[PDB]
Amino acid sequence: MSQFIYPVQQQPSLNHFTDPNNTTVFIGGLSSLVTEDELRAYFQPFGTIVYVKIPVGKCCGFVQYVDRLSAEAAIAGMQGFPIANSRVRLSWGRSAKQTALLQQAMLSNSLQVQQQQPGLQQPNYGYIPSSTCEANVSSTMLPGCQILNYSNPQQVIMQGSEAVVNSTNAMLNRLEQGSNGFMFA
Amino acid sequence: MDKYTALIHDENFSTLTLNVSRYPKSLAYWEKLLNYIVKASAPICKSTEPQLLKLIRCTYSSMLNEFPYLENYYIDFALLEYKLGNVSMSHKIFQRGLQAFNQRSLLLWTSYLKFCNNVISHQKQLFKKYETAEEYVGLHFFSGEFWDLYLEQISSRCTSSKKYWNVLRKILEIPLHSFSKFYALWLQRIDDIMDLKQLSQLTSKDELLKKLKIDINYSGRKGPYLQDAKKKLKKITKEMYMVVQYQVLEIYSIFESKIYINYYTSPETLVSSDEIETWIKYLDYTITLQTDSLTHLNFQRALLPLAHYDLVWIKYSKWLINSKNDLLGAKNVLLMGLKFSLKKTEIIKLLYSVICKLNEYVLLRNLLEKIESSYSDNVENVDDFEIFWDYLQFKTFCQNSLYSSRYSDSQSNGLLNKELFDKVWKRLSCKEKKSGQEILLNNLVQFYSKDTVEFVEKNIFQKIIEFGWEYYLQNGMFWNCYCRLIYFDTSRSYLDKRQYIVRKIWPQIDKKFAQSVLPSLTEFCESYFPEEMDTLEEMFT
Amino acid sequence: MNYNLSKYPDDVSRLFKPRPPLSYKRPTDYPYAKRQTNPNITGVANLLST
RNA sequence: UGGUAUGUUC
RNA sequence: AUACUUACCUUAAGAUAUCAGAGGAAAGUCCUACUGAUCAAACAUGCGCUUCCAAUAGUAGAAGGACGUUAAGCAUUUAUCAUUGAACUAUAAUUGUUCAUUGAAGUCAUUGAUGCAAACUCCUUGGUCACACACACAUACGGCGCGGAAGGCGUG
């Protein structure tokens, strides 16, 4: 036979660490004084967030981004940052239903098998990953512009030129209003 | 008539030329126009019409000004100029094409060296071109074909054969896609060693004696001593292979399996989101590894599918700013990114701030003059507000620094300068056609001094009152900004400002507008005047 | 050597791979237009007297 | 009385 | 392989050592397992012929390379032509000097080229033979061990 052959390798068995599609972030070490909106305000600018939830009393939370890129920017950006006087340990975690399935498999100790988080269905042309929109469009769809984006919660909206106004506009709102106390987050 | 005039009186040449001239950036028009010109020369020879050849050279060179990253057409214009006979112009076309890519391109270096081989005929200089090519493009993941070119030139030309070992030992450490082939060449080329002195080809004498315990000057029976030596060097190669195989299989499995498009297409092509994500992650990996030749090569290698986006022009600029500590480098990256990218607003913002850090304010004045000149001295009327607002902030910085202040306590008059205030009023006067009205009011509010508050109150608040513009009067943010202008005056006392807001301002707004104004105005009132919150509620019900 | 103008197959024509191209050296003789034997061959009649 | 070459048939 | 089909060809002549002598088919020709002399080739074979054939008692050396490194070594020297405008020096049509414009060609090089010189590293090649570790020589030097390489000369 020939001296050059293609390499072959074993699969690494699919937990939440070895899933390439996993976009949810386990934040651990939460301070129990921090709400879901206050944590959303921390993890918002890294991407668009499918959902943010905090288990009652369990001193940990989850943030589920839309992209893998956004989530890795989150884990690199906010690692050991003190959210309300307690340093925060970030890692990959699973969802809510997947966690319920792992706990019911942990009681019966039967299998503990995970399944893979869904992917977008490549190729997508409009989407530039890790890019956020806050709120009559005639788009020419030329490439530098961002034709498509995810609506904040959930829907698919086309970004425009006008949105760089709206974010700035909303920004001045939470500099003023949140200063007086009407949103702590 | 000749073949040129038969070409120039063709009906098609008019439409093809004219479509290119209408739509310069669309490139299917340029390719149809160029293919038609070249095909209407049935045989390109040294006697074909010199007017027609001059027309061909003008067409390709203008296309390579419009689209400077098309590698295949730099090669094709060089080969056409070769066929016509002058190898000097083909040299200059290859070097022009290498210059468009900052020397960092594998296809142009590969083709320029396969060309150069035939026509240099000076050996030191031919090899110095391979040593120049290797520092720019030699660490490319697909750069195996370059190293094949360099090794076949060495193995034909050199008589000594030490240069082959010295090149191949370097190639053994690069994590190339085709890394094994050069391991197989080293293994065969070790296996054919026929005595002890040849082992000084591999490394030095002292390293063999000290590290591997081989004596080349061993006099004795030399057969089994040589077999032992070859077994030891085959082991040390096995460990080096094992390292490089880990590198290459990691890079392939995460990143290079995922990228499908490696070449520039046209300013109108889109890239899938998957490839944008893996290019961003693959650049992050490269920046971690800290090989600067390879980081520059990978940014240049990444600009090919997505030159026209701007996320990598920004990213490459940021890497030069904070990881290499180089601001003139980052200015040159962003400045070149103006040429390519279609969006340009985030690049101009970041480039203004890079220049301001580099203390080069005259260049900032020239870029502000070119942006006001690009909109015909009429940036106030631009549809996209981000251009006007970034322009206006940095123009205000230059203007406060250029003209001394007119108001007390050295309070630099930002938007209250007759050059800038006229632009701001001219954009405020369009009322709904333009986009950024509340941001502009909300920054005009921020002056907080008696002389400044009086000017801002009289010129934009009283005047939009007396003109009766319904857009501003029904809008809650107008009244909120006006109350917030007066309330944060450091001059006026508390009873004075509460007296002014409740007694003078709040009657002026119409009662038809209450359903539009009361959400915002309440939000002022509860924030600062809880006591007067009855009065407001009584005034509008 | 991408192509073959010869009758042989490709493997046979790779065997006839030439040496590298010749280097250039400046000439030490006369350029082809300046070559001539002797002109100004002087006359034979001067001998005949003396 | 020949040679080399070509292609078909078996 | 056969066979068949076509297509392309089917030719410069002459000679085989020289000179002299005897014979055969007055001038010449031809020939003589005829005879002298010269020449040339092969093969044997010799010359007190001439030159050359590497430490191991040591880590060398000789011959020839490098299309090898130091090396951007050290020292010199090179990088277009025409047209038009502008300032400019001036004995001057504006000769000199600088800036831009149109056209024409244009090996790459300037880390080059050329001059000089040195160190270092490495390749190929050889009887790395035998007996010796020795007081020689004016006719200056036993050329009086076996081979090998190359020529010079002589004989058969």
Q: Which of B296, B25, B14 is nearest to B135 (CA)?
A: B296
Query: Which nucleotides in chain E lie closer than 7 A to a protein CB?
Result: 58-59, 65-68, 106-109, 111-113, 121-124
Q: Provide the residue type at B132 as one letter.
A: T
Report DSSP state, residue A50.
E
How many C-beta neighbours within 10 Å does residue A116 have?
Answer: 10
Q: How far, in Å, are B226, B232, B407 from residue B211 at the CA level?
A: 16, 11, 79
CB nearest B309 (choices: A123, A143, A165) = A143
Q: How far, in Å, are B124, B366, B375, B413 from residue B399 at the CA level?
A: 58, 14, 20, 9
The spacing between the Cα labelled CA in B217 and the C1' in E62, in angstroms, equals 21
Experimental approach taken = cryo-EM
CB nearest B157 (choices: C17, C20, C24) = C20
Chain A residues lying within 8 Å of B308, measured CB to CB: 143-144
The spacing between the Cα labelled CA in B209 and the C1' in E122, in angstroms, equals 19
User: Do residues A107 and A47 lie in contact, with contact meaning Cβ atoms separated by under 8 Å?
Assistant: no
- The pair of structure tokens assigned to B520 is 């915002």
* C-alpha neighbours within 13 Å on the C-beta side of residue B530: 2
DSSP string, B306-331: TTTSSHHHHHHHHIIIIIS--HHHHH
CB nearest B270 (choices: A67, A143, A161) = A143
Model resolution, angstroms: 3.2
- Which single residue is written with the structure tokens 């039967």? A110
Q: Which of A30, A9, A124, A130 is nearest to A85 (CA)?
A: A30
Q: How far does CA B465 lie from the centroid of its chain?
A: 47
Chain B residues lying within 8 Å of C23, measured CB to CB: 121-123
Q: Which of B381, B420, B425 is nearest to B398 (CA)?
A: B420
Label residue A40 exposed, middle or buried (CB < 10 Å: 0-12, 13-18, 19+): middle
Residue B157, CB, less than 7 Å from strand E? yes
Q: How far, in Å, are B119, B148, B440, B447, B503 from residue B489 at the CA level?
A: 79, 76, 19, 8, 17
CB contact under 8 A, A143 and B281: no
Report DSSP state, residue A148.
B
Q: H-helix or E-strand containing B299?
A: helix B292-302
Select from B277, B283, B313 the residue whose CB has the most chain A CBs within 10 Å, as the one to mutate to test that interface: B277
- Which single residue is written with the structure tokens 């200059």? B92
User: Do residues B413 and B406 lie in contact, with contact meaning Cβ atoms separated by under 8 Å?
Assistant: yes
DSSP H helical segments within B120-222, as ranges? 123-137, 144-157, 162-171, 179-191, 199-202, 205-207
User: Do residues B391 and B368 lie in contact, with contact meaning Cβ atoms separated by under 8 Å?
Assistant: yes
- For residue A60, list its beta bridge partners: A28
How far, in Å, CA of B476 to CA of B465, rounded? 14
- The pair of structure tokens assigned to B404 is 């001394």
- The pair of structure tokens assigned to B170 is 């370097």
- For residue A27, list its beta bridge partners: A61, A90
How far, in Å, CA of B293 to CA of B314, rounded? 19
Radius of gyration of chain C (CA): 27
Q: Which residues of B234-273 are buried (b: 16+ CB within 10 A; e: fewer)?
A: eeebeeebeebeeebeebeeebeebbeeeebbbbeebbbb
Q: Beta strand pairing status for A24-28 and A89-92? A: antiparallel
How far, in Å, CA of B364 to CA of B335, rounded? 12
Q: How far does CA C3 lie from the centroid of its chain?
A: 29
Report DSSP state, residue B501.
I
User: Do residues B66 and B30 lie in contact, with contact meaning Cβ atoms separated by under 8 Å?
Assistant: yes
Label residue B530 exposed, middle or buried (CB < 10 Å: 0-12, 13-18, 19+): exposed
Q: Provide the residue type at B498 as one letter.
A: R
The spacing between the Cα labelled CA in B474 and the C1' in E88, in angstroms, equals 72
- The pair of structure tokens assigned to C42 is 């002087």
- Our CA angle for A175, A176, A182, nearest 5°, is 100
